[PDB]
């Protein structure tokens, strides 16, 4: 499917998170398409367990 | 009562170009006239009252002047941006009245229309009409033709034109053409074809589907 | 700044009543005049009312003169007309304008417009439906896509595309009365062809007489 | 009945522009040499050239 530039934004963010191993970029990634309307608790998921990762 | 007759009705010149519209009181008012423009199915805005005196923010490329009875509007330098009408008011008695307008068009360089078709949805089909839509895109002069052929069958009647105003920036027109017809009457039907004559075009333009492809 | 707001403006039946309102803000209509001003779709202006709020003295055109009544409330810095025996004729935008403000002799600041309609015909939502992008509407690169917002009464519609965030290349029609005495009119947009499937393109569709609100995606079939 | 009368203004520099004029056909015609008088104080003096049983002029300013 297609995203608007919020959705494009919060995949952008997790492709960019360092810490991230891919498994974990993936996973993440692909709850964003799962579920828009869960986009901003997502991405706040995945910078916690990135900074946990640093 | 007294009216304001404005003139010319339409106005068309190229940017850059010094144009000047005219509204005459029918009886002395003083200096007790204002010129509104009108635009992009805004507000009216005033650019000039008393005659002569630009309101503030307003462009100095517009002024106004009065000879007895008749007042004038000079746009000097005319922008793509000044495509509007533009109404003359008279306060010197109630009813304060307006003129009927001028409307000024931006001559340009012609130029042919991408022209598209949408075959009905699949959503509309689901109940009873269905809609084709011709659309010419982003062309210059207004004047152009749009025919309707189904099954090479010309049609008459059942079509219907709406145009944009004049682009702010490009100064092009976009035209649609609607053809309305029963889900039934278009199930019964193959070729669906919108015929497009312009002064852009060396010669017409078809764009056309048939029913059910992809 | 100055602003002047213009509500109440709706769908009413020949002979009914409908009352305006014309909010001040920015300044106070106790140092001005206030004025009604109307314009039939597609037609010229037409001066409809005035008065000054300070002293209540009031003036009308004839056509309207005994059927509307203005008035004000400097206390809410608000201006009225009830438009009373209404007739298809008074079918119009009415905007509410301000003259002398600031001492100029002109009507320097406008409302948006509140629209008027004067019908027996009732109100009815549009359907939306996608014009959606094929090959029949590419070339260069550049894809042209949209909505039909189709059978719907009174006017107005709006639409936007992507909550306001789409604006260029986008043709929004006039609306066209249908034989059915309905609306009809389509809005369409170009974007890069390459754009098609990854950007998603919504068309926002508000008919407020009718309550509809739609959001419509529109992609390729 | 309402007729329209088109108009080119041709000006001495080779700028054109066109208008319409619309009322009786005697008002639309007084209109437009009324028209063609005023732009000629700043344009030059005019020439009008009627065809089509005067419901097209071309109006020429001298510069
Ligand atoms: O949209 C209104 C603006 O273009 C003018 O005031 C200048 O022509």
């Known amino acids: 499917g297609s995203y608007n530039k919020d959705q494009q934004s919060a995949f952008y963010e997790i492709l960019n998170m360092p810490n991230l191993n891919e498994a974990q970029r993936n996973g993440f990634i692909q709850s964003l398409k799962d579920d828009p309307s869960q986009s901003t608790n997502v991405l706040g998921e995945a910078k916690k367990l990135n900074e946990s990762q640093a | 009562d007294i009216q304001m007759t404005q003139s010319p009705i339409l106005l068309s010149a190229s940017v850059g170009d010094r144009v000047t519209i005219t509204c005459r009181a029918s009886?002395?008012?003083?200096?007790?006239v204002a010129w509104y423009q009108q635009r992009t199915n805004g507000s009216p805005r005033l650019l000039i009252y008393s005659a002569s005196f630009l309101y503030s923010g307003v462009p100095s490329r517009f002024s106004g002047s009065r000879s007895g009875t008749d007042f004038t509007l000079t746009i000097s330098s005319l922008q793509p941006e000044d495509e509007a009408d533009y109404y003359c008011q008279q306060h010197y008695t109630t009813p304060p009245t307006f003129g009927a307008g001028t409307k000024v068009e931006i001559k340009r360089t012609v130029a042919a229309p991408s022209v598209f078709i949408f075959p009905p949805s699949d959503e509309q089909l689901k109940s009873g009409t269905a809609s084709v839509v011709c659309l010419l895109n982003n062309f210059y002069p207004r004047e152009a033709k749009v025919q309707w052929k189904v099954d090479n069958a010309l049609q008459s009647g059942n079509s219907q034109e709406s145009v944009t105003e004049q682009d702010s920036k490009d100064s092009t027109y976009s035209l649609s053409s609607t053809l309305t017809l029963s889900k039934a009457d278009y199930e019964k039907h193959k070729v669906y074809a919108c015929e497009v004559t312009h002064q852009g075009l060396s010669s017409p333009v078809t764009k056309s589907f048939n029913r059910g492809e992809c | 700044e100055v602003q002047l707001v213009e509500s109440g403006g709706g769908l009413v039946q020949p002979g009914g009543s409908l009352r305006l309102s014309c909010a001040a803000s920015?300044?106070?209509?106790?140092?001005?005049?206030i004025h009604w001003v109307r314009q039939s779709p597609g037609k010229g202006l037409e001066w409809v009312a005035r008065?000054?709020?300070?002293?209540?003295?009031?003036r009308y055109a004839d056509s309207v003169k005994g059927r509307f009544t203005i008035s004000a409330d400097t206390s809410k810095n608000t201006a009225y007309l009830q438009m009373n025996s209404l007739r298809a004729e008074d079918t119009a935008i009415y905007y509410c304008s301000r003259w002398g403000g600031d001492g100029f002799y002109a009507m320097d600041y406008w409302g948006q417009g509140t629209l008027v309609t004067v019908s027996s015909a009732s109100t009815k939502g549009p359907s939306v439906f996608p014009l959606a992008p094929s090959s029949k509407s590419t070339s260069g690169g550049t894809a042209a896509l949209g909505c039909l917002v189709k059978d719907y009464f009174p006017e107005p519609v709006t639409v936007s595309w992507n909550s306001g965030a789409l604006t260029s290349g986008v043709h929004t029609f006039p609306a066209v009365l249908q034989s059915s005495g309905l609306y009809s009119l389509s809005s369409v947009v170009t974007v890069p062809s390459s754009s098609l499937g990854t950007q998603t393109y919504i068309c926002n569709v508000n008919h407020k007489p009718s309550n509809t609100k739609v959001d419509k995606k529109v992609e390729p079939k | 009945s309402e007729v329209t009368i088109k108009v080119n203004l041709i000006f001495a520099d080779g700028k054109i522009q066109t208008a319409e004029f619309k009322g009786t056909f005697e008002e639309a015609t007084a209109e437009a040499y009324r028209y063609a008088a005023l732009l000629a104080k700043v344009n030059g003096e005019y020439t009008a050239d009627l065809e089509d049983g005067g419901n097209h002029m071309n109006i020429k300013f001298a510069g």
């Open positions: 009886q002395d008012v003083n200096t007790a």
């Open positions: 920015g300044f106070n209509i106790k140092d001005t005049y």
């Open positions: 008065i000054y709020p300070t002293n209540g003295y009031t």
